[PDB]
Structures are given as C-alpha cells and as structure tokens.
Amino acid sequence: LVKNKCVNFNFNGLTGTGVLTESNKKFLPFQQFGRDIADTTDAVRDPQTLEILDITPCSFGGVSVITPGTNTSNQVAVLYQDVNCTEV
Amino acid sequence: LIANQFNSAIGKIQDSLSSTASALGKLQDVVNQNAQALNTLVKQLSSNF
C-alpha cells in the first residue's frame, strides 16, 4: 500500500479513489470502516497491519477561462478555483 | 444640548449591540437558511431512492 498520493485502492471489496494517510481515529475491534455524513467511507483499517488510514478524495476544482473577445485576441488566462499553484 | 443628546444616543447603540444577540436576526436567518438548504442536499446522497 502506498500513502500520501492519489491511488485507486481496494480493501476487502471496498473500492474507491483517494489519498491514504496515517490517522489518529480510535477504532474498536468490532468495527473496521469509518463513515462520512453523506455515507461515504472516511477511514479504513488495514486488513493486515491494523492501523487506521484516512481516505481523502484527490484534489479537484473548477477551471475558468478568462478571455477578451475573439474579436480582439486569441490569448486567454486560466483560473484554477480554490487550488494552489502546485497541482496544476 | 442637542450635541450631548446625539452623543448619548450613539453610546446606547454600542450597549444595545454588545449584549443583545437577537439584534442581528435578519442577517443570521439568511446565513442559516443557506447552510440548512445545503446540508439537506448533502444528506440526499445517503438515500436509496
């Protein structure tokens, strides 16, 4: 298992895409799966090394195109909304 | 006399705001309605339909 990078994981038939990180969520022996308000998984227990992993969906956001009219130029600027200048 | 009444009237506004939270209800309700509407949208993902 690879951590801190967007990966496509499969835990015991549970599939999804997200970033797996170490977590400080204190699970209990009868429970393996954490859960979100919207019923999506939020933490898994590693089936072989029992540490709890956080699942964060890979970074995303809207992309806007800022342009003068094509009656003036064909040059445009791109705004990546609510994202740093690293994931571009 | 008029200037002193004005200065005291402004001072009372500060005392009113600093203690009564309900004074801003017209703006808090707008914030609450949008957050309440958005949370309902999120909860709908948990339904089977």
């Binding site: 919207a38 909304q81 | 703006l27 808090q28 914030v31």
Partner: peptide, 22 residues
C-alpha cells in the same frame, strides 16, 4: 453574525476591506 461532493463557495468580488472603505 457567524464539501467533497462538488459543492463549493465562491468568494465575493468586493472584499470586506473594500466594503468598509465605501
């Protein structure tokens, strides 16, 4: 006066500092 599912909030064009200046 006081997420991961495609729901975002856009920032207002007039920042609060500009509102006070007006």
């Amino acid at each position: 006066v006081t997420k991961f599912n495609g729901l975002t909030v856009l920032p207002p064009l007039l920042t609060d500092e500009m509102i006070a200046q007006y």
